[model samples]
Target: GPGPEDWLSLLLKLEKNSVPLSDALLNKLIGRYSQAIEALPPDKYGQNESFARIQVRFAELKAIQEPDDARDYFQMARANCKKFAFVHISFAQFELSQGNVKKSKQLLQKAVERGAVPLEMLEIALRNLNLQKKQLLSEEE
Candidate 1:
């Protein structure tokens, strides 16, 4: 009972070694992340180096385990993104996986707001957003 980061610690410890991992241990690792993170505050997510990895892993697992409620898990990352920039990146990865390009683009734009992310990328995204806006307006006319 070392607390919430315990699972992350073990997951990294195993990765540090050259020994092969057992599916059993992997299962336990994923399971613990899902349970612990769910009870943890979404805003504080975590300061661990692999925080986004933990979140993305849980989101993928939940998407498989409880397909109907999967999006809710990913939303936690987005909600906390204001405090944790990479959390938005994590959610963007999930959106891409689910073929939600529109949502993914929005998350990337959110990432752009924090400064020095990538100027060229931001400009491209700005262009895309304007195009989408124009396309939508054209349809209404």
Candidate 2:
């Protein structure tokens, strides 16, 4: 059985293009992420940071591979790991990458309300958005 670290390592490999983004590998990563999420501690003791992190990973990959079914993972992050701002931040960043700037801006605000530490990063994202919008405007003009 692959540990969480192994799952992340393999994901890194996939991201870096070391391993091909084959359906089998992505499915395998999803399987391990699901396993890790199921094995985490109970929610009564506040929240599990690791659980949220793994769920973010699950959400990220699922969003890319199976976009329509990805919201459940994001919902799980919001419901069970409310304290983990990075979950929202990560999803926001992913949305930005997907050219969904409005939704990305919304999630970044949610992360702000949750007290995100990378304050400068969030600030920079809007700057990035400005650039993206300008580029799109230029394309239309």
Candidate 3:
């Protein structure tokens, strides 16, 4: 059986390849990683570290192509970790895609308040907000 690091490495590789991942496949990968960590000895220094690492991986996955579908998984993650900034960002993306800029901004603001706003997320939000402003201006004109 592959070790925890091996599984994580494989997931990273798959992500880097931009291979389309089914929800089932992503869930399986997460489950395997969780199991591997759980099997480790109690004294294992890095077991909890995997939690953050996995969350980052999930965020990366959600940040890629399918933001809409990613929103669902992000929501699930948020239910478990309400302060997870990445999940909020993912939800913001979902709202943005649906043209719900107000809702997106609200979520992003929460992320900022939680001190979880990454630079990339802020940049994207700025760009989207600017574009939305331009669109509204155009409509007004």
Against the unseen true structure, what C-alpha lDDT does each candidate score?
0.57, 0.65, 0.55
lDDT of 1 by residue, 1-141 (tens): 344467567655654552465656556656667665665564554454355566766776666555567788778655543445445555655565566778877876766776523355445545544454321112211
Error of 1 at 129 (Å): 13
TM-score of each: 0.54, 0.67, 0.48
Each model's Cα RMSD: 9.2, 6.3, 8.2
In model 1, which range of ten residues has the least summed lDDT? 132-141
Q: Candidate 3 local accuracy as lDDT?
A: 0.55
The window of 10 residues in a row where model 2 has the poorest summed lDDT is: 132-141
- As for lDDT, the candidate ahead, 1 or 2, is 2
Better of 1 and 3 by TM-score: 1
- In candidate 3, stretches whose alpha carbon ends up further than 4 angstroms from where it belongs are 1-6, 16-70, 80-84, 117-120, 133-141
Expressed as tens digits, the lDDT of each residue in 1-141 for candidate 2 is: 544455556655655663766888778777766766665543642365555667788888889787767777777776676666566666666666667789877876776767665466556555656677422111211
